[PDB]
Amino acid sequence: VSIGAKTVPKVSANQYRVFKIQLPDPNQFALPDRTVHNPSKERLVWAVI
Amino acid sequence: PTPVSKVLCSETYVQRKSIFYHAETERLLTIGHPYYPVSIGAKTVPKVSANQYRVFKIQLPDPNQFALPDRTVHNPSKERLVWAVIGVQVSRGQPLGGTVTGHPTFNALLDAENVNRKVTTQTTDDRKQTGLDAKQQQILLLGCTPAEGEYWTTARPCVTDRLENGACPPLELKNKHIEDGDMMEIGFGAANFKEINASKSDLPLDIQNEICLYPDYLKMAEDAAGNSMFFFARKEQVYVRHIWTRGGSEKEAPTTDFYLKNNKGDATLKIPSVHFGSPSGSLVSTDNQIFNRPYWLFRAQGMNNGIAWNNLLFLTVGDNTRGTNLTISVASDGTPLTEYDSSKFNVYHRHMEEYKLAFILELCSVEITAQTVSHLQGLMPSVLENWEIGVQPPTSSILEDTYRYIESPATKCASNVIPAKEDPYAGFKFWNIDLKEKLSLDLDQFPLGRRFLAQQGAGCSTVRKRRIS
Amino acid sequence: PTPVSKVLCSETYVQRKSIFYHAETERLLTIGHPYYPVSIGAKTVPKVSANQYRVFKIQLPDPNQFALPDRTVHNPSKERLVWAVIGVQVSRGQPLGGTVTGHPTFNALLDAENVNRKVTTQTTDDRKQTGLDAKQQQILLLGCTPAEGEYWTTARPCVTDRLENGACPPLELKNKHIEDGDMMEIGFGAANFKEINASKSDLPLDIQNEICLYPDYLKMAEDAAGNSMFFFARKEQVYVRHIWTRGGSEKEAPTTDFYLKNNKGDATLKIPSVHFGSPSGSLVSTDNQIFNRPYWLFRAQGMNNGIAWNNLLFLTVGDNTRGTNLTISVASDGTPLTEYDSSKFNVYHRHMEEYKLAFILELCSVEITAQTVSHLQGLMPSVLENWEIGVQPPTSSILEDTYRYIESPATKCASNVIPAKEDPYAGFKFWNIDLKEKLSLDLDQFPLGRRFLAQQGAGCSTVRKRRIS
Amino acid sequence: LENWEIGVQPPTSSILEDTYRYIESPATKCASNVIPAKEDPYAGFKFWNI
Amino acid sequence: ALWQQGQKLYLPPTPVSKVLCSETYVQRKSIFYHAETERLLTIGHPYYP
């Protein structure tokens, strides 16, 4: 719809709400130890459970 | 147990891990008319001068909220992690040169000259076009809280009434913090001139109507925290270059005990006798400028040796050394001029400043013992809050509304947005530099890293190009 | 010592004794007009509907002030006793059936029919008498604090002005607690319709002008305490049964890109195009209804596995399943009618709902260690007061002045009036069920006791009437 | 394999790229130049971003 | 600090009224019987006599 010079999103009950859940990169995070993966051996990621 | 009675030193409850990070900001540019904000059409042009304390808020990535791939990483409820600066290297990229400033119609009746004709009674106007070179200086500071400045203003005059319209305003000192677009000190005392120059002819046009701050070093050296400044450097030379005289009518002349009258002369002196000199900036060198020189902070001057409390840093860096204005000339018609007219070429005026920021933060875990925890109550109210140490409910646990397209007339207005916890320094504003992602862990990679390891001894690149001569 | 910053599950500082009690409320009845409060003479008739959350406040007998025949009972200053629910069995006594609701003059222009004559321009009125079956559902939830609901309302519009008189109101979500006479959700979104229906033809007459709540399950699942709900059950089926159309003038029709005009037709569409369906509840069964079924609570969904903090319980039970209205017909003269007139018999309208409540509380002693004591400060402000742990300054050591015949004029006036202290939940109101005396210790005696011991294994009566077929 | 930094000519970090303040000013160049920074791939299509 | 008045405190009385479960005084022999009624019919107008 359009009232004035603004809009009104057509929000229906029949539309695939598609979320992009953007994550916090797991590779650039604070490592307070040594057992944390070695810098060049491997990279960390996320896995949904 | 809350037996605390005296300020303590941050090293005592702060554990320093042996981890380092490199936070490099991408080069920042800003350009514009330095003297005052311009307005073409319905848009603006920030008044970007060479005499304004660029004050960066380097917002950090909260250390506490990070990925722990192990157990030796601090236990969840014992200790908290923070940031600690070790190295800072502010890089200034621009061609060296001197800063100049002037004004269309300045107020200067006469100067220090012996063979100049006799002073003509002041005409309706005596103003002239005035050149006035900046008073060269440089100020670099880092800390936790914004740096404080001092200035002079007019203090409310008392009820006692012996007042007149031309009566001299009382004065008084005032503190304030230093924001992003403040004025550097160019030759004249610091004050919100707005109430001191009612003539509009007393200042260089760029500085006028704006407040001149200064570093209240005294105040900074007194705060227990020391949050005000981790360290700091300053280099500034100046000296008189001309000597002038204001052109205002006098409400107070030198009594007859100082001024001896002459034949056919006048009983009282009428021409004003204010002699202010024009500030002069010293020649600038390739060695005098304090920049591009990594500063290793080994011990701060306060009980806080560089702890980024609140995951925040304040960089107050100002220098009129780099800056030089840039002229331009566009044809008033769009076609190269075939003949030389005084009306055809429009003179434009732009100045451009560029910075870079680099930090060598390290990880450091503060213990959370009943005693030390307590202690911070009096050191700071706020860091104990975000940290999640004491609160009614987890911020996350609470559920709050959030809309999509909050600008839609279907939805409520944006003002309601204020309910979420609000940044404290929102009233004041300054350049906001985000470093949440441009942060790494490989020292070798970056410029300031090698520069670091070099000094350390773990160097694949030692800083030595020995020159004999 | 005050170290803790995150909540601890209630089991850790709560000792469970092995004692049980049986609290059975005597059957409760209430009767009245299904739709709105009536008024005959100078008395009233509560509008008792089948679509209102009966919310009981089951006030308990303070545990910490009981009888202890032994030394084994907790030491006077180390520990405190409370109540913990284990079993709840809400019994609903009435004949099963479906709930209906209607309205004298509803707003429905036309329906989903293909052989119906063409739509006549809306006349001055198009309302008709409307039947509308209830959207069958059932909700039960026990907890410490009143359950929270959500609804839609109109949020103040902005200063920005592009307003008109018929302009649609902005909307926004709001929370509230659920009180005794609130409305169940019947087919339409939840909102204080009072500001949404300016037509009086948009709702079923019973629901209109009243607020429709809903269970904000999301909110309940987020509270650390979990006080909001120990457990809960819900069963609700619905589906469209007819499809209708409002009868209001339109401020926004489908643009020409959707609606294709026809010969001799009109440029813009004028008849409103709102298609809301009417929801009819699915057939109700003897097995679907969730009641008379003892609920053994073994682990709550929060850190509070059923602790009656503040010696208080909240039972929010609503279902439109049991309810069916009751008609009546009295002769308008008091004498049986000899002939059948349309004026002689006055139709009356009474409906009646009945409940029962049964709990299997157990005794449980919370320790009172400096640490655990402290802990509750952030869990709840109020239950500490019941404990009496907090200090109250010795100010009865200030000598105030009493007087004799404070009435005498010479004597002080004594005009000031002490103000009675408010209760925690006095602004809101709900059914108040007192259980301070109707509580016991002999499990075998009551209905829900055998039902309990049966499951336990200590049974004189095991719940088994095995049927083979 | 790219973002991860496993194989690339130079660290993105290493490059010094321009960035202005008040890029909407008329003193400064327009926002279109903003595209040079690495661009999200799904930018043509759009969806709720959480 | 001073001696004040607290609300009434409880006690457990004796109804000495426990009911008993009939199995306790009832012995069950192991004998069984089968009582079958012959089919019953009734017919008529349901609405009214």
Tab-separated table of C-alpha atoms in Angstrom, chain B residues 13-17 64 72-82 364-369 387:
chain	number	residue	atom	x	y	z
B	13	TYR	CA	44.055	-7.328	40.224
B	14	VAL	CA	44.876	-7.611	36.518
B	15	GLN	CA	46.536	-10.699	35.084
B	16	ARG	CA	48.391	-10.223	31.884
B	17	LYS	CA	48.210	-13.135	29.490
B	64	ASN	CA	34.759	-11.483	27.060
B	72	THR	CA	43.009	-23.153	30.450
B	73	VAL	CA	41.071	-20.246	28.924
B	74	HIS	CA	39.648	-18.394	31.903
B	75	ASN	CA	36.975	-20.206	33.883
B	76	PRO	CA	33.485	-18.898	33.209
B	77	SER	CA	32.843	-17.366	36.632
B	78	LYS	CA	36.280	-16.707	38.122
B	79	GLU	CA	37.735	-14.122	35.728
B	80	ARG	CA	36.963	-11.697	32.883
B	81	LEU	CA	39.090	-10.664	29.940
B	82	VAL	CA	39.824	-7.228	28.601
B	364	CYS	CA	44.497	-9.638	30.141
B	365	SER	CA	42.263	-11.402	32.656
B	366	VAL	CA	41.037	-9.615	35.750
B	367	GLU	CA	40.226	-11.903	38.656
B	368	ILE	CA	36.793	-11.638	40.237
B	369	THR	CA	37.284	-12.047	43.980
B	387	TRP	CA	30.510	-7.041	32.320
